[PDB]
């Protein structure tokens, strides 16, 4: 695996060499010689299917650790975990804003990104890893946040919807499905408290800030993008180590930038000086629950609340279960570690209240002719 | 039974022999169509470690 991964990384710098040539010729100086035609075909037709199947079979080998072995036997070394992380980052940057240049090979690239994401032991890499490898993973989240911010501001009809077309097709086809898979992978393996710590949190906050900002937007593009945005936001909530819906209790959360970093810092990098101001347009948990309850009892149909059903509800359906285990009413093994008060106030009442509202929402739209959101809501609840 | 540490050596050479040769062969659709499954099968048999 070490030699196989090293060759794959060797082809990654080769891949970056001819895509720039393709970008150059597609911009100026058209020429169909294609000096790297052999390299392009080998990368697309051999490497991508090989990466797709190799890491599908040996997914448990790379996710295994000496503390906890998942596969039949053996576990990847730290260097192997570092290389597979750099492979994901280089491949993601390769396809960034170049989905069209891959032609029919773009579905192959994103499928490799999905499988590489499911085989990322990011806990070990971020804890004990080289700065270069860690900086690559941080740059991926930062780049993802910037692309989503450009996407949402274009969905705000700042542009009719140049680079707007490239950014829009890259995010909805490559960035969003991959980011959803990566967050789901982090949530399943409890990597949130180890990966999203200092600058990933800032990147994840901006992604959380921007995605929810579609509530005050009414367009045709936004209507078809809600299922993708909602699923991505739900996975982010499961992996987010901070209770962004309960900023009043953030002082008791160890995995927060406002506790890990000094007040002297957090000013060299732009931060709003208060946890409540990170995403101020997100209603607090108490407010959010009241709004859903009011809509459910009012008998409102799906047409007058598409944002809540497609985005807000999946967020709460994933936020509450995560923080029910870390707050009051949890089954606490906290005889030694019970001194810090819980950073959340989620109890079984919140989950019970939300479930009752969801059931009332469904029956309000029980007899309508078309509702494709019911199947998506069922799996989230 | 299990491999005898010599079949794995043959399998490892078989993988890199095809991989290196295919990396320099000019693109042939027929060759690539059946060489790729061979590499995937070989890679899926060798232990990663």
Curated annotation (Swiss-Prot), chain B:
Post-translational modification: The N-terminus is blocked.
Residues annotated as signal peptide: none
Coiled-coil residues: none
Record's subcellular location: Sarcoplasmic reticulum membrane
UniProt tissue specificity: Detected in skeletal muscle (at protein level). Fast- or slow-twitch skeletal muscle.
Subunit architecture: Homotetramer. Can also form heterotetramers with RYR2. Identified in a complex composed of RYR1, PDE4D, PKA, FKBP1A and protein phosphatase 1 (PP1). Repeated very high-level exercise decreases interaction with PDE4D and protein phosphatase 1 (PP1). Interacts with CALM; CALM with bound calcium inhibits the RYR1 channel activity. Interacts with S100A1. Interacts with FKBP1A; this stabilizes the closed conformation of the channel. Interacts with CACNA1S; interaction with CACNA1S is important for activation of the RYR1 channel. Interacts with CACNB1.
Domain notes: The calcium release channel activity resides in the C-terminal region while the remaining part of the protein constitutes the 'foot' structure spanning the junctional gap between the sarcoplasmic reticulum (SR) and the T-tubule. Pore opening is mediated via the cytoplasmic calcium-binding domains that mediate a small rotation of the channel-forming transmembrane regions that then leads to channel opening.
Anything else known: Binding of [3H]ryanodine indicates that the heterozygous channel is activated by Ca(2+) concentrations 4-fold lower than normal. Single-cell analysis of cotransfected cells shows a significantly increased resting cytoplasmic Ca(2+) level and a significantly reduced luminal Ca(2+) level.
Function according to Swiss-Prot or TrEMBL: Cytosolic calcium-activated calcium channel that mediates the release of Ca(2+) from the sarcoplasmic reticulum into the cytosol and thereby plays a key role in triggering muscle contraction following depolarization of T-tubules. Repeated very high-level exercise increases the open probability of the channel and leads to Ca(2+) leaking into the cytoplasm. Can also mediate the release of Ca(2+) from intracellular stores in neurons, and may thereby promote prolonged Ca(2+) signaling in the brain. Required for normal embryonic development of muscle fibers and skeletal muscle.
Family: Belongs to the ryanodine receptor (TC 1.A.3.1) family. RYR1 subfamily.
Protein name per the record: Ryanodine receptor 1
Full protein: residues contained: 2665 to 2713 of 5037
